[PDB]
Design a protein around this nucleic acid. Structure first.
Lengths: 64, 97, 50, 84
RNA sequence: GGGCAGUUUGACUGGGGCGGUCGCCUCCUAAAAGGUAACGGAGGCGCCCAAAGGUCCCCUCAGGCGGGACGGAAAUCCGCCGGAGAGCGCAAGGGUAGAAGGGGGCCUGACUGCGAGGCCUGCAAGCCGAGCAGGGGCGAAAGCCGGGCCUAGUGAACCGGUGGU
RNA sequence: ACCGGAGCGCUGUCUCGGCGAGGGACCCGGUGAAAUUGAACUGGCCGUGAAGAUGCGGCCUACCCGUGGCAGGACGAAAAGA
RNA sequence: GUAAGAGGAGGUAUAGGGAGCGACGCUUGCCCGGUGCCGGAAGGUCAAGGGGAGGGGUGCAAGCCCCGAACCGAAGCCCCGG
RNA sequence: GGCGUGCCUAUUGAAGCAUGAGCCGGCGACUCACGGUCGUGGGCGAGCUUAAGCCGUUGAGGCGGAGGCGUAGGGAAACCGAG
RNA sequence: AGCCAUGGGGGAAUCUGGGCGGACCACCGCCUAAGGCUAAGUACUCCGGGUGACCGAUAGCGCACCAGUACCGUGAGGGAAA
RNA sequence: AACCUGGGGAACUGAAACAUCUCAGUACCCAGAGGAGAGGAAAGAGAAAUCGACUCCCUGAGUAGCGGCGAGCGAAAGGGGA
């Protein structure tokens, strides 16, 4: 029956409604202290593509 | 080996607690190039079973398009779209008086 | 290693941070070193917790 | 098969060779950002319209044409001159 | 609470046990970029500093001969010879005195919002960062400051904890 | 009806085996299996080959086919190696 | 056996269950440090429970609901000993 | 008389002294159900197309717009809006 | 962490009574509990007939002809051929 | 024989291990009920001063939710009809 959208990556990723899957930056959690603002403002967003074609698929049915 | 590049991190602010989703007044973004396509009047009943709309609550006139001496009917009006009413049009909010 | 314990220099004016590290093994007490928060200028910056 | 006494070591570890060298040569055009040398010490030294950040590495400031400089009594330099 | 029920019991390897090991950095093996395998070579690292950061003013080694209470192949000073073998936290490599070394005055840019563009590489991270807008230190000024001569001082994501919008 | 060691009498266990005996086999007569089975028109040396050949090669004895008998090879059958 | 009951046993500690060596004749040494077994009205921690100082939301208010201290608690492991 | 080391499988690699296989007749393995997704044949056009079902049918079709698709995305959100 | 259901323990009232609007208190709505009967459209194939871009004795149901007979094993059950 | 409501309730697998989970309250055991049953007239349903027993088909929609927030699991209102 109807394939199930993967609730997970659905609950945690973006793709601009043109087809370019663009995600969210990590390595940002339990660090911060000896680090600097450079890593801060950089640790504000992310990118990606190529295998996020397979991920663009994994989204599935409602596309999104 | 690793998780499916699951190294990504979730944010999904309010991914729904459990009692359900917020029963909220959803919308309908629209353009005045669509208002330009038809003259006369753009009420709900017309635009719903024609145009776009589809049984979906508040309409918001906006975007670029053309200014014409016609009547619209919606619920919220963008400041930009409010200015295409200036050149020619009508401004009807929330119906009931 | 500790005795050099780390801290997040919280500023007054109700928050805004910059992160550092102390030095208990040095006469360093608390530290209100002059730094610049996300909002404003080079104002104050004190010391809190770990 | 009576394999008499053997031994063991410690010399199995090897650091990872990170890519080194100069990236541009005389001619190419940098565009503010196009780094040019991943060097250790001053094997090459910056000058006109060429910078050098924290790793000893010369890079880009202008839309320049690359050139070198032999100086010996100071070493070797890498200069950039765009249009003028 | 082994009387019974249920799973776990890594990988390593000149056939297996044992030891040893899984990450990073140094330079050989690397055949003049890269780069590369071995129970092939020798090694170091999971820390550090409110000054060991910062701007400006200043001085410049090791050692070599001669000379000196204690010292005395080494204390230290002096005279001269000495262009980096000194020192540059801890491994080296490399670079360095036309400073990055050693002393001092005023501070405190281990800033905020970004981010041009490259190195690297499957990805993911890692990486150098013009220049811009706020504001601040130094210096008359030119100009410098988004940590320390550098190559390790690391841990994706959820699950939570505190302060806060 | 348990494992060593030694002496006595006795014996085909051995030296060294010979004869005979009935029954299998061998010839005729009645009937008639099996595992294995790609096909074979299937000999040997010296080398060849993923290391061990009738078959490749520089080369061997020998008319065609059979019967009794021995057991070396077909990496021999029993297994999808204890 | 979930039990009901059953066996044990219409037996009674010269009995019935377990372990250990396996006639009889001679014999049995060191240690409670561990562990288990034993024995213990001090002491420690500690489950639900009792409790209520403080405390929150809310309604004008009476109030309803939740967070919840001090102190009390055994079995157990530690503790004293055999 | 010149030339010639079976087949399949397996393998860095077979005449292999690795194996399947005596011979033959026949049976016997890449489909479909949902959805996606790229390319394709057409009706359509800022538009498309109905589902259950109902009417009819005796291999006879039409009707039924709920709904999905499409025009606005951008912030997780409130929401701002070709920004 | 709601509502339903309930095993224990504590244990109401009879319409400002009760339960719910997702912990809970305030405001506003919903509906009257702890006893009961209900056709219709649903679901299926022992079975009647009817049909098929279903098969033709290795196919087809296992069983086309006396198939749940032979025969396997005490047994549950296996399962032909023709 | 199937369909049916309750009374108990698996393991293999997926997660490339594996206990939360899943497989599924699914196979399977009991019992009973009948062409039907089961169910069933509102302490409902839920945001508007909205509808109004039950079962069925559809969309709602893999949506809303759920989870070592992994595998994966996964509904109700509304509306179109019986």
């Amino acid at each position: 029956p109807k394939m199930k959208t993967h609730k997970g990556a659905k609950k945690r990723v973006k793709i601009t409604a043109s087809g370019k899957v663009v995600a969210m930056k990590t390595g940002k959690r339990h660090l911060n202290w000896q680090k600097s603002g450079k890593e801060i403002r950089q640790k504000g967003r992310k990118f990606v593509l190529a295998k996020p074609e397979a991920e663009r698929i994994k989204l599935l049915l409602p596309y999104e | 080996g690793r998780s499916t590049t699951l190294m990504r991190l979730p944010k999904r602010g309010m991914q729904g607690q459990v009692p359900g989703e917020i029963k909220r007044p959803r919308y309908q973004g629209v353009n005045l190039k669509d208002l330009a396509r038809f003259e006369g009047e753009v009420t709900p009943e017309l635009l719903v079973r024609a145009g776009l709309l589809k049984k979906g609550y508040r309409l918001k006139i906006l975007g670029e398009g053309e200014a014409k001496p016609l009547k619209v009917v919606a619920h919220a009006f963008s400041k930009s779209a409010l200015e295409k009413l200036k050149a020619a049009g009508g401004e009807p909010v929330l119906l009931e008086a | 290693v500790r005795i050099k314990l780390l801290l997040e220099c919280t500023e007054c004016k109700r928050r805004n941070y910059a992160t550092e590290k102390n030095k208990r093994n040095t006469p360093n007490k608390l530290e209100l070193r002059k730094y610049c928060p996300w909002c404003r200028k080079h104002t104050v910056h004190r010391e809190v917790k770990i | 098969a009576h394999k008499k006494g053997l031994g063991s070591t410690r010399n199995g570890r090897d650091s990872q060779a990170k890519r080194l060298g100069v990236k541009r040569y005389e001619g190419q055009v940098v565009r503010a950002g196009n780094i040019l040398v991943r060097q250790r010490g001053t094997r090459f030294k910056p000058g006109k319209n060429v910078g050098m950040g924290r790793d000893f590495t010369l890079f880009a400031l202008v839309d320049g044409v690359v050139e070198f400089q032999d100086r010996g009594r100071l070493g070797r330099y890498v200069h950039v001159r765009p249009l003028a």
